[PDB]
Design a protein around this ligand. Sequence first.
Ligand SMILES: Cc1ncc(COP(=O)(O)O)c(/C=N/[C@@H](CCC(=O)O)C(=O)O)c1O
Ligand SMILES: Cc1ncc(COP(=O)(O)O)c(/C=N/[C@@H](CCC(=O)O)C(=O)O)c1O
Lengths: 412, 409
Amino acid sequence: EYKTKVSRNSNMSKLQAGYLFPEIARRRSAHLLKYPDAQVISLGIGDTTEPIPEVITSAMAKKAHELSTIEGYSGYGAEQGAKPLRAAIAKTFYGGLGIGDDDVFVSDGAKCDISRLQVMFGSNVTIAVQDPSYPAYVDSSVIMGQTGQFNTDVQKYGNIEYMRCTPENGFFPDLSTVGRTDIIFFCSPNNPTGAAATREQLTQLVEFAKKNGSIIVYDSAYAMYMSDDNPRSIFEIPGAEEVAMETASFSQYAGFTGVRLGWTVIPKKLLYSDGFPVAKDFNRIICTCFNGASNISQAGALACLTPEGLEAMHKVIGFYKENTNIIIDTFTSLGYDVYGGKNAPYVWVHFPNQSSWDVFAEILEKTHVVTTPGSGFGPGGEGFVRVSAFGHRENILEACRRFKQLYKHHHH
Amino acid sequence: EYKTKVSRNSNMSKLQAGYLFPEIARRRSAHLLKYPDAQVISLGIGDTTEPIPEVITSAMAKKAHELSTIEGYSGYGAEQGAKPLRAAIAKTFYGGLGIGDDDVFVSDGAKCDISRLQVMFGSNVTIAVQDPSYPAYVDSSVIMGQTGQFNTDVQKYGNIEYMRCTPENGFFPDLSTVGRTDIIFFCSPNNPTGAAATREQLTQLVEFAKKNGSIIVYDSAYAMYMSDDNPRSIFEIPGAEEVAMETASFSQYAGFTGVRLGWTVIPKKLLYSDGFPVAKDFNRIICTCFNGASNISQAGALACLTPEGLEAMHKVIGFYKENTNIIIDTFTSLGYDVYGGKNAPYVWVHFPNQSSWDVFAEILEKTHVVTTPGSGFGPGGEGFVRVSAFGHRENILEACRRFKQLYKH
Ligand SMILES: Cc1ncc(COP(=O)(O)O)c(/C=N/[C@@H](CCC(=O)O)C(=O)O)c1O
Ligand SMILES: Cc1ncc(COP(=O)(O)O)c(/C=N/[C@@H](CCC(=O)O)C(=O)O)c1O
């Protein structure tokens, strides 16, 4: 059996298992072999379920049609994205926050931008993440060589600064206790906890990055779910343009999870220690490692950013926020400490004194409802389960009655 | 002025200039500033110009409409791509070559795959490339930390094996002179030379990778332009499956340069030195660093691989092959040494005693035609210019009559 003489990338070897969501997919499949007739409801992966609004799909169809006309055909786009789309994103989301069209970089979504940013930052930076949070910041970090090995004692990669976000701290790190790193990944509203940082917290965040000379990578993918009067962009914090960039996506606003369209904003005043603008290196990465978001996806996003698009998106968002209420009420009425839900389509449920993988296995086993074990998001998620509110209304309602049956004798 | 204390990535500092194609777009823009009424003809970046066939755009439009219905909506797909699409690619382009559906990974294009492969290989591998070739291979390698600095005497980045491809050698390198590396990026039909490696030459390539325990990254971006009877896939060479992967795209086949859809094939028997299957690590990258190609672009790609889609694509390709011949005839009648254009929609024109960039500048200034300086494709490209054949027939004709007029006396 022939083998090349190329060594496996030693950063790939560092990873402890596969990406969490494939692991759940595999456990779901195993469950359906065990229970061939089970009506499985997924509240696991944060995947949108409701149709894209027609105003948006019509623009995509019209663009597809135009590609077969002489006047309408277009080929390669500027890798930064169509100017009018960059302009629409700059005005709609950062109007008055001093962001130009040219600070916006359109991508095929936030997961890809995080990895492209990690390529730009390179192997020699250190990172901080919320603990828990979205597994891609850590995993991208390991793959690029920014970490040591996984320590199975603490459930942590070496050299990553994990900032615990717990009910006892209001799901915001105690920054006086957080070590300096080059990069701070900060997601708000947070996946998985649902917690949105207040203006005073984000102010502390920017102050902390400024004294440490760090870069905040701010993930606003769920900002449109905000209910409380908290900032939706890091650039609402004066000083942020010196220490922060932001990544966003239409995945969770327009149901573009399969259509693929996000953006990153890197401000002009964000500079490396030698004065070099970070936006110039990202622009290099985006020109060399990427050939632009799909022309049809970009036509769809442009349609989102119109009175009719914004109205359609708000309505779908409103639907998921009502699902989220149904879920919150269910657990609260069952006597659980339930977190998130207010500002985010995730409910973060406290299952103390159990391993979250066990709670996950139990719920799956007995109710045929898939959830996401907290420990999939880091050692700070242990003791919790994330429940996703994306689903048709009937499925949400049915999941909740299955919860009520499962848990009626736990509480008290 | 405030600065962070994050050190700039030193691999980013290594890079000599901006990426080639943006730099050309920038000179085109300046030219239009200088002469706002210039009727500019763009034959630089190899960007397709003709409309996508209706059978293909119809499928994409249909998928968009379905996304607004209960029953037709879909969110996240497999990061590897829709199974029917992996099945269509495996059978259409590799039927009989031992390629399974699960060895195909659908991407948003070849440039993206090249960089994802490079994240996957990591910074500890050494690469070889053809010289000249498509600059993304060298630049991704620099970005990933696989290289030394740029040496301006030789015009090469340190620690890359530039395999010399010349008119004299048939643009196929003498492999006895090529040092061992981990990765060998090989493009056939090659961009910028248009040269397609024969069956015998690829056999030598596989034998060389096999003795050196190298991995071949075979880029077949232009394979559908083959006229000569040469293999279109590296997997046509027995033993390729132990040493090679392939990257391709719908960009040049269907005009998806803006729609975004390609694929990589990584065979089961491709293993690192510890025996670990390389495809398995690519799959981890693709799950961690990517969220799948656009559902609409996937539906377009699926419609391509049907009798109606293959006929329609074939017809567009033949239109650009006609364009390329017009361009060959023009330059050969002006008495230039002209290469390529047989198996590729590019012509590779020798301008002796003159820098590629000055030739680019002169053509653009005098005729308002954008071309590509050959030195953008590495040091072996110096003294050549690449001319792309993509364009409406009237624009190719006008460009050619402009060349003749400029160069005839
Ligand atoms: C905080 C955060 N950032 C980025 C993303 C991905 O955005 P896209 O690549 O634009 O669809 C998401 C989507 N997350 C879902 C989907 C899973 C995934 O994208 O890996 C989840 O955790 O269940 C996210 O929550
Ligand atoms: C040998 C080869 N491999 C990969 C690509 C990238 O194609 P896609 O990302 O699929 O559209 C290309 C496309 N090259 C163009 C476009 C510029 C670019 O992709 O950077 C050119 O050489 O003019 C290529 O020539």
